[PDB]
Amino acid sequence: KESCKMFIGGLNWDTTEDNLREYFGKYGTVTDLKIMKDPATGRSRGFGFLSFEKPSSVDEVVKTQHILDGKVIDPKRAIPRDEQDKTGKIFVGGIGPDVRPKEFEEFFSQWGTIIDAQLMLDKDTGQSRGFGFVTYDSADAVDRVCQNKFIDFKDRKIEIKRAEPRH
RNA sequence: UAUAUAUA
């Protein structure tokens, strides 16, 4: 059920749920998949929720990076809406070479558990450097950094601002 | 310094 639900992101708009299930079919059988198509706007969300009848598939799903239709995705465990609401996403800048995405997650962890943190790098053409994306289990953690606009990370201070629309 | 992730 929902407990076995997985979150899929970084999916090619052309990507279809059928390919999704087929892609993750190797792992087993999917009980409920949600690529999150957008027949209205005409463009899919680009991410979906994948569920498996057997939770075992989920364990293996995270082990692999996952490359679908020439794109890269990061399948992660689904987060309950109530818990999801508590969490938030902030924007960070001042990220460069030697930053290491792993260090980025541990770096921000100092002021928050950090449910998830990434450099985006959808195409690995630049998002990986320059700025970063961090998610916090609690909104309160975000406030800590708000007070701390500049943090000593790579010994060059970074500027952090609450998440904003792509505009 | 920007999300084809958190589904209106």
From Swiss-Prot:
Modified how: Methylated by HMT1. The methylation is required for nuclear export.
Compartment(s): Cytoplasm; Nucleus; Cytoplasm, Stress granule
Superkingdom to which the source organism belongs: Eukaryota
Domain RRM stretches: 4-86, 88-165
Chain positions found as Phosphoserine: 51
Function according to Swiss-Prot or TrEMBL: RNA-binding protein, which is involved in the polyadenylation-dependent pre-mRNA 3'-end formation and cooperates with the cleavage factor CFIA complex and the cleavage and polyadenylation factor (CPF) complex. May be involved in regulation of poly(A) site selection. Is involved in nonsense-mediated mRNA decay. Seems to bind to an RNA downstream sequence element (DSE) located 3' of a nonsense codon and may mark the transcript for decay.
Complex formation: Interacts with NAM7.
Protein name as it appears in the record: Nuclear polyadenylated RNA-binding protein 4
Lineage, broadest ranks: Eukaryota, Fungi, Dikarya, Ascomycota, Saccharomycotina
Name of encoding gene: HRP1
Residues of the full protein shown: 156 to 322 of 534
